[PDB]
Amino acid sequence: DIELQKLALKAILTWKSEGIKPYQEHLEYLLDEARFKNELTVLFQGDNKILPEHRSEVIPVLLHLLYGRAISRKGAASGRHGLHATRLAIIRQLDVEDMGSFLDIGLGPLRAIRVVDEQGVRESVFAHEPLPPRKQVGLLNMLEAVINELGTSVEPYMDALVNSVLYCLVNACRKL
Amino acid sequence: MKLNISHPANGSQKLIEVEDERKLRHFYDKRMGAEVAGDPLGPEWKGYILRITGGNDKQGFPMKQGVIAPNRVRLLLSEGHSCYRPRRDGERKRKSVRGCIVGPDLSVLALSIVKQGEQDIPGLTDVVHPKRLGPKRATKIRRFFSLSKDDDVRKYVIRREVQPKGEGKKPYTKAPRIQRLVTPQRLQHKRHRIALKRRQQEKVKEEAAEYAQILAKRVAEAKAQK
Amino acid sequence: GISRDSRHKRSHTGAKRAFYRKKRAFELGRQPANTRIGPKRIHIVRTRGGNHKYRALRLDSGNFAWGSEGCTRKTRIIGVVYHPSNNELVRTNTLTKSAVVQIDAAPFRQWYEAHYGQPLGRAAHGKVDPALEKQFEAGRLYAIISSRPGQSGRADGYILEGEELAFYQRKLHK
Amino acid sequence: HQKRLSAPSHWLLDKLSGAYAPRPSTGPHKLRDCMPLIVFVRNRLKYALNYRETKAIMMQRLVKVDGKVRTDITYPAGFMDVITIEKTGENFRLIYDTKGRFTVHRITDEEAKYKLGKVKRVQLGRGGVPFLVTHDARTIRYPDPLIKVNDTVKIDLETGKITDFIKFDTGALAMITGGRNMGRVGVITHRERHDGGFGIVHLKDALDNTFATRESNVFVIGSEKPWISLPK
Amino acid sequence: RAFLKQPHIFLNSKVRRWYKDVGLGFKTPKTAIEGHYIDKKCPFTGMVSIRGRILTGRVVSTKMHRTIIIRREYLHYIPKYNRYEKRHKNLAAHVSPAFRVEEGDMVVVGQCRPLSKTVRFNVLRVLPRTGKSVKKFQKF
Amino acid sequence: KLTNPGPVPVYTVAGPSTARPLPDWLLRRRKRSAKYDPENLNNFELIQEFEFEEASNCVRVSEDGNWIMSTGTYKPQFHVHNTRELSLSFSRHTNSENVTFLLLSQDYSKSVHLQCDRTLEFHTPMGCHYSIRIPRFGRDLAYLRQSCEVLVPAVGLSSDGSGYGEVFRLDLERGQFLRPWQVDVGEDEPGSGLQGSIHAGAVNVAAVAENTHGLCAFGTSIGTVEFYDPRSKSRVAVLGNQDGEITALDYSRDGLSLALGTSTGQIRIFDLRNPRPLLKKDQGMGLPIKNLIHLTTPTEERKLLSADKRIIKIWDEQSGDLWTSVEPLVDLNFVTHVPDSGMILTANEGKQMHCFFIPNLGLAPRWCHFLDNLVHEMESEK
Amino acid sequence: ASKGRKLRYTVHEKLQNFMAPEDRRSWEEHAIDRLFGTLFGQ
RNA sequence: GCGAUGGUUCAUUCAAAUUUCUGCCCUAUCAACUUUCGACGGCUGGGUAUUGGCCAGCCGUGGUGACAACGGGUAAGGGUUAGGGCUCGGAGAAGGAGCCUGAGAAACGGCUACUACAUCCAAGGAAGGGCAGGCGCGCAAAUUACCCA
RNA sequence: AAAUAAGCCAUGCGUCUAAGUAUAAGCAAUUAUACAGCGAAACUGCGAAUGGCUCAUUAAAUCAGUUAUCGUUUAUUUGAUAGUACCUUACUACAUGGAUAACCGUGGUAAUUCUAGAGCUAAUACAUGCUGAAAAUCCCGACUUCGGAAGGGAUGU
């Protein structure tokens, strides 16, 4: 929700840290709903790029906010140009190192999931649902965008993506 | 400088004659919208603090907020500004207005009491004035009376009784015709709109299917000629 | 005073003419927009038929087409390199049509390593002309502007590749 | 607000209707190829007397033009518009005569139900669909795929669909609606291309007068097949 | 100068030439089919469309950057003399480099959109004749 | 009104709030349709309609001090503000986006500007006395008052004669272009046009004095500042080879010392007789400095510095210590000061033209007295 | 040759009597010509 | 379910803008004219609703003319065919300069500044720029008519 | 039914339909009370590219015939017209907002809406606008009893 995101960002700025201090103007324009796509290419590929000294300070806040903007259904159009290009324009500009925290906020309960053990199939895991069938669809669309925007650089993140995609696939194959 | 003092929270207002400019010296060099204490004005104003909201100097010129000159200035006023109304659309007119600064040359000072004191001004703080009209749209009636989903605004609307002519007949009630009230006429209008949409899409479907079969028939007859 | 009529100029036979008529609103020509590099400053002009054209005066980003591979991405604009018409637009960095300007390369590089996977500028279908590879190792490509920035409100265009790329490199060397 | 003499010579006005003449409002048919409804009601038919009487006829739903109620007084009705009046129970049709003027034709519902309209152009509209534009500015979506330019169409006028079509043909009788040989019902016997603008046809009447009229000014009416009743 | 191009044809692919016929019973010359010049006011290379009037005539001055002037002669009827008189006019036309140019030849031109203050025509057919200089006369 | 620095405060009394403001159409839509709670007291403007909605180019206050002429970008125009009546006197449109104007008379009754489509436009309050095309492009504009003659620099090399480079000068009593004062710029390609090439060939800044001797100082792109003398019509000096393109040129109050500056961001205070610099300062970042003028707090002397990295630093001359520094939050293209004291008017890239107030360099000017009381109220707020 | 590029020295008619020459020079003309000699060369 | 209002695109109508060949009255006490606001191109862009030297950068050498250009004089018809009749046919709103609306104006309807008249006032201030009529000697001659039927 | 002036002098001078917004403290009423009929004021939409006046003129540039727009804009007219859901808010959301005018009051000035301050209230005015639901809607169609369809791809302008 855009109002709750704005009030939450105001509280994050009430936390007064010098890593967030030079980026506040760039932060609030992402929640201003008319200047999101321009502010994305102001943030990345700009003269005011994120400095790698306090990159460790801004990136969790920024990625929770960009995640919320990628979720929100209100201002987006229909079709692909509505919100599919928005998810693609976030993930195409994100770094592969920040993408780990991006998928960390992406996968809530399926972050620490294990599909395969020393034995074959974990039927104890598979005979249980942690997510709604409504909610897995946006997860799979997001991971499709992540993989199609990453390419080879998935190699440091092999251990969880395949567990997620395999869990949703075999839950569907049980539900046929 | 006579003080046109308004209490907006009670909705009352009163003009007060003030002589002895030594009493009015603390109003000097204060911009519009500034908070001044009314304590050095009079003993009946103990605890009052008020904002200054405008005024008219000598020769009756208005005082627009945001002009740093103390004297009378000659602004160019656009459409949606104060101190000027357009005679026609698109008109920018040069008008003289008094600057924001309260000087000695004023005639009336518009004041607004924001915080009272323990004493009541007898004609100002004592009289209550209700609002002229009640709310018209249903959700503002809902937020006013804090209704739930069931309590059906149409009996919770405000009312007013008037006595008409005809040598003193019965009282008569008046009620403001709620705008955002979902009536079955409104719902049937919505249903007729989406029914027009589905009728148009099925007519496009049938005409497209019949064009498909007729076009296949015509190219079959053309290849039968060939 | 700026107009589009032909009543002030001499004829085909070499004769001037009086032909005095007042300037009319269909001979109307407005003042030029030297679109420069900055943050987005666009003013909307209403025109005949009530139709809006977007006079962009300061622009930052536009999308550029690496279309031999099948992508176009929104990238920023660094500074104009050369202009075929004027030198003052090169001096004061004015974005017009058919301007060769250098742009950023990061989304094109990202899409290359995302689709093919072989990294670039740091099997056989992923293949890059080595001049364009030098542009990627610089991290700043040589694009050309195909959209009118003044009469559309955006500075978009395609990237230079092959013969045009080599031609404008030789013209930069000129 | 044109004068009575500057009004065209084919919707007639006598020495009676004042020095001025009504102009037709903008609509389907052209300006100079037009009969307004007030000239049809009170200057041709004389079912009315005055402008206010014509307004009192028009404003109540008593005059229907091409099967729809036409309210405004100077509505253009140029060519072959069936005009249904229900209180009198008549349907008039507009054709021409041999001299070049408007002619009215009384008819009932069976010939009043359809309209013979000449195709102006065929194109591919939005949605990838072929559409058809007649001289009444009627656009028909999804037509029959042989109905090309200068073909005429029997429009249903209760749904508006295509029912039949007559092809442009050397040997099909036609009606002239323009030019110096205006209004001469005869048979198309020859057609010359003249590519580069303004091609012609050579046309003869029933009784051997050859003349050349332009393919814009022609209008196909039927081979023999008088699908509208030309007045006997 | 900028690199001349046919405006919408993708040359730099790693996986042609656009020439339209003018029509009107004309044939495209081989230089207009394959010859590697690029000109946008050419009716076979550029997007210029020929419509309307179709004229002929004899060239005065071939020596100009792709623009020839035609002296068109005609016989005007003066009623005071009740006689025919010679009247010469000068047209201008943009020249494609597809054809082989001569002086004094009889050239066919065609009407297009205004390409300059004078230039409203393009060459379409050249008839190579041994026509002479300004002393030569023929209504044509 | 804001205050940017800690020790010596400046005051952004009027100015754009955001580096990327929205479209004014969308701003008015959200204002008239949404609910907003603005700072009604401290946020204001001081002169009416002191903006252009695109950008701005130059600000000059007259020697009478009653008129502020300012040229800006969309529907390229110049506003004339009467500063006693705190409003627009008028605004007149032009043919293209203006480069640089000067007032000729003590009032606004005569103006001249060098203008982007190679013109010089002379303006009266009646209208516009007609324009003169300069033959080649121009960079700045200066005025010989004692022998009334406009002199503009030019970029590129001349057509015939010598291949030095040129400064176009026309008298106003005589009316014609006299002769281009010939300044060497360097070598250029023999194969080019007559407007030059993209790399070099530019004279940038022309500076003169109007109360002292008035040596016509020019400055060109190969690090060269030149000196010409009036009544000689010929060269006097060529000096100051630097690495950067010379963009600053301004005399002091005495009539001896020069303050020049280069396109990398290095300023040199020279003497007119000593080749070695009196002062050097390498500041800011690599964006080129634009404008430097000397300004006297009533006892001392100090100097401006304005650079397009949004840095305007007021330096000291007697010690060289950085007195104060302002970040205008946007690109700024021109600086001027009110000749009394205190107020720096800056033409920017943004929508609103912004002006700074130094209480510690001077007082509020004679037309906006209450600015000192507003600074006083902000001092109460802190 | 073309539009403005050659300095056509023509006396301009409305540009003829704009401004009067106002000599504002605080130095006394005898010290100034001695100054321009004693620059970096001398 | 029937309409009213509104909406994207394509029509159509009503227009408007350019644009092709021919046709003006006389005159050589008008033979050179254009390049003197570019004069003829072509390339590139800008601006226009669009083409276009219309405008800006680069270069090429032109363009018209004794078959009557150019300059000068000011005295500024077409269609409908017995006939006559009938029909159609630039600049300004006190003076320059700049701006605003709208599908359509460079409205002159408004604004701003300068210039020039002129009105009210409590002397601080504030609003405004036409035609028609009579006299035009002291002696003269057609209604200040009624209605949109 | 024909009926020079230059200068003086007075007088004369929008827009409402059943079909946008009515709590006029406006009129007129009763047999089921948000509104219902008439409806001034005001907000909203339309209108004024002319009716016609004056006077230095326009010498194939206008204008006429004759073309073209494959080089352009078009309110109004009339005709067709829009397949565009889901896509991590769910431990959710499901009668959408705020402004003002008219109005009510307190005034300033010599100076008419020249207007200031204070309190309201509507929209077809300006403005946002995931949702009942495990479906929707397009192209393919194997198998076929006309059966009507297993399941495959896909998501405007």
CA E44 to each of CA E54, E94, E108: distance values in angstroms, whole numbers, following the listed order: 17, 13, 15
User: What is the spatial distance between Cα C101 and Cα C89, in angstroms, rounded to a whole number?
Assistant: 11
Nucleotide nearest residue E87, measured CA to C1': H67
Chain A residues with CB under 8 Å of F26 CB are 34
Residues 6+ apart with CB under 8 A from F328: F12, F15, F310, F312, F346, F348, F354, F356
Residues 6+ apart with CB under 8 A from F215: F208, F209, F227, F228, F229, F236, F272, G36
Query: What is the distance in angstroms between the Cα of A149 and the nearest Cα belonging to chain C?
Result: 5
Cβ-in-10-Å burial (0-12, 13-18, 19+) of D230 comes to middle
- Answer yes or no: is E9 CB < 7 A from strand H: no
Nearest to A148 among C104, C107, C114 (CB): C114
Chain D residues with CB under 8 Å of E52 CB are 197
- Answer yes or no: is C115 CB < 7 A from strand H: no
User: What is the spatial distance between Cα E53 and Cα D180, in angstroms, rounded to a whole number?
Assistant: 24
Q: Please state the three-class secondary structure of chain F as a single string.
A: CCCCCCCCCCEEEECCCCCCCCCHHHHHHHHHHCCCCCCCCCCCCCCCCCECCCCEEEEEECCCCCEEEEEECCCCEEEEEECCCCEEEEEEECCCCEEEEEECCCCCCCEEEEECCCEEEEECCCCEEEEEECCCCCCCCEEECCCCEEEEECECCCCCCCCCCEEEEEECCCCCECCCEECCCCCCCCCCCCCCCCCCCEEEEEECCCCCCCCEEEEECCCEEEEEECCCCEEEEEECCCCCCEEEEEECCCCCCEEEEECCCEEEEECCCCCCCCEEEECCCCCCEEECCEECCCCCCEECCEECCCEEEEEECCCCCEEEEECCCCCEEEEEECCCCCEEEEEECCCECEEEECCCCCCCCCCCCCHHHHHHHHHHHC
What is the amino acid identity at position A168? C
E24 with D197: Cβ contact below 8 A: no
* A176 within 8 A of A119, measured Cβ to Cβ: no
Residue positions counted in chain C: 174
- Chains F/B: 3 or more C-beta pairs closer than 8 A? yes
* C141 within 8 A of C135, measured Cβ to Cβ: yes
Buried b (16+ CB within 10 A) or exposed e, E20-40: eebeeeeeebeebeebeeebe
User: What is the spatial distance between Cα C37 and Cα F331, in angstroms, rounded to a whole number?
Assistant: 11
Nucleotide nearest residue E68, measured CA to C1': H41
The residues facing C47 across adjacent strands are C51
Q: Which residue has the tokens 């603090």?
A: B49
Residues 6+ apart with CB under 8 A from D138: D28, D117, D155, D160
User: What is the spatial distance between Cα D45 and Cα A18, in angstroms, rounded to a whole number?
Assistant: 90
What is the amino acid identity at position F285? M
* F279 within 8 A of F252, measured Cβ to Cβ: no
- Chains A/G: 3 or more C-beta pairs closer than 8 A? no
What is the amino acid identity at position D143? P
Q: Helices A36-43 & A84-91, crossing angle to 10 degrees?
A: 10
* F293 within 8 A of F337, measured Cβ to Cβ: yes
List, in sequence order, every beta strand (DSSP E) within chain E: 54-61, 67-78, 83-94, 106-111, 121-127
* B51 within 8 A of B34, measured Cβ to Cβ: yes
Chain B residues with CB under 8 Å of F368 CB are 68-69
User: What is the spatial distance between Cα F143 and Cα F122, in angstroms, rounded to a whole number?
Assistant: 13
Q: What is the resolution of this structure in A?
A: 7.1
3-class DSSP state of B215: helix
CB-based contact, G30 to chain F, within 8 Å:
no
Residue positions counted in chain E: 140
Which residues 102-121 in chain B have a CB closer than 7 A to strand I? Answer: 107-108, 110-112
Region label for F69, one of left (φ > 0), alpha (ψ between -120 and 50) or beta (otherwise): beta
Please name which of C69, C58, C62 lies closest in space to residue C101, comparing C-alpha atoms.
Answer: C62
- Answer yes or no: is B213 CB < 7 A from strand I: no
F134 with G4: Cβ contact below 8 A: yes
Which residues 134-163 in chain D have a CB closer than 7 A to strand H? Answer: 137, 139
Cβ of B156: how many Cβ atoms within 10 Å? 13
Q: How was this one solved?
A: cryo-EM
The spacing between the Cα labelled CA in B119 and the C1' in I36, in angstroms, equals 51
List, in sequence order, every beta strand (DSSP E) within B99-218: 106-115, 160-162, 172-174
Residues 6+ apart with CB under 8 A from F41: B31, B33, B34
Q: CA neighbours within 13 Å on the CB side: how many for E102?
A: 15
Nucleotide nearest residue A79, measured CA to C1': I155
User: What is the spatial distance between Cα F56 and Cα E13, in angstroms, rounded to a whole number?
Assistant: 45
CB-based contact, D127 to chain E, within 8 Å:
no
Strands E54-61 and D63-65, by their bridges, are unpaired
List, in sequence order, every beta strand (DSSP E) within chain B: 2-7, 12-16, 35-37, 49-57, 72-77, 93-98, 106-115, 160-162, 172-174
The residues facing C145 across adjacent strands are C157
DSSP string covering chain D: --BTTTS-TTS---TTS-SB-PPPPSSSS-STT--BHHIIIIIII-S-SSHHHHHHHHTTTTEEETTEE--STT-B--SS--EEETTTTEEEEEEE-SSS-EEEEEE-HHHHT-EEEEEEEEEEETTTEEEEEETT--EEES--TT--TT-EEEE-SSS--EEEEE---TTSEEEE-SSTT-S--EEEEEEE--TTS--EEEEE-TTS-EEEEETTTEEEEESS--SS----
User: What is the spatial distance between Cα F252 and Cα A136, in angstroms, rounded to a whole number?
Assistant: 73
- Name the residue closest to H10, CA to C1': D125
Nearest to G4 among F118, F146, F273 (CB): F118
* F127 within 8 A of F88, measured Cβ to Cβ: no
CB-based contact, A42 to chain F, within 8 Å:
yes
State the DSSP H helix or E strand holding residue C37, giving kind and residue range, or none if neither: strand C36-37
E10 with C84: Cβ contact below 8 A: no
User: What is the spatial distance between Cα A161 and Cα D184, in angstroms, rounded to a whole number?
Assistant: 82
User: What is the spatial distance between Cα A74 and Cα C93, in angstroms, rounded to a whole number?
Assistant: 39
Please name which of F262, F212, F255, F216 lies closest in space to residue F240, comparing C-alpha atoms.
Answer: F262
Residue in chain E nearest D197 by alpha carbon = E52
CA D57 to each of CA D35, D87, E33, G14: distance values in angstroms, whole numbers, following the listed order: 17, 11, 68, 71
CA F340 to each of CA F262, F289, F336, F347, F365: distance values in angstroms, whole numbers, following the listed order: 29, 25, 12, 19, 6
- Answer yes or no: is B129 CB < 7 A from strand I: yes
Based on C-alpha coordinates, what's the Rg of chain B? 33
- Chains A/C: 3 or more C-beta pairs closer than 8 A? yes
E12 with C98: Cβ contact below 8 A: no
What strand order describes the sheet that includes F181-182?
F142-144, F149-153, F166-171, F181-182
Which site among A2, A35, A36, A41 would you substitute to test the F interface, given the most F Cβ atoms closer than 10 Å to its Cβ?
A35
Q: Helices A158-175 & A135-150, crossing angle to 10 degrees?
A: 140
The spacing between the Cα labelled CA in A28 and the C1' in I80, in angstroms, equals 47
- Answer yes or no: is E69 CB < 7 A from strand H: yes
3-class DSSP state of G10: coil
- Chains E/F: 3 or more C-beta pairs closer than 8 A? no
Query: What is the distance in angstroms between the Cα of F43 and the nearest Cα belonging to chain B?
Result: 8
Nucleotide nearest residue E53, measured CA to C1': H20
A34 with F22: Cβ contact below 8 A: yes
Chain C residues with CB under 8 Å of E3 CB are 163-164, 167-168
- Tokens for C135, please give them: 């542009």
State CA A37 to chain mean position distance. Answer: 16
Residues 6+ apart with CB under 8 A from B31: B65, B100, B101, F41
CA B137 to each of CA B151, B176, B186, C50: distance values in angstroms, whole numbers, following the listed order: 15, 9, 15, 36
Number of C:E CB contacts under 8 A?
Answer: 26
Number of F:G CB contacts under 8 A?
Answer: 91
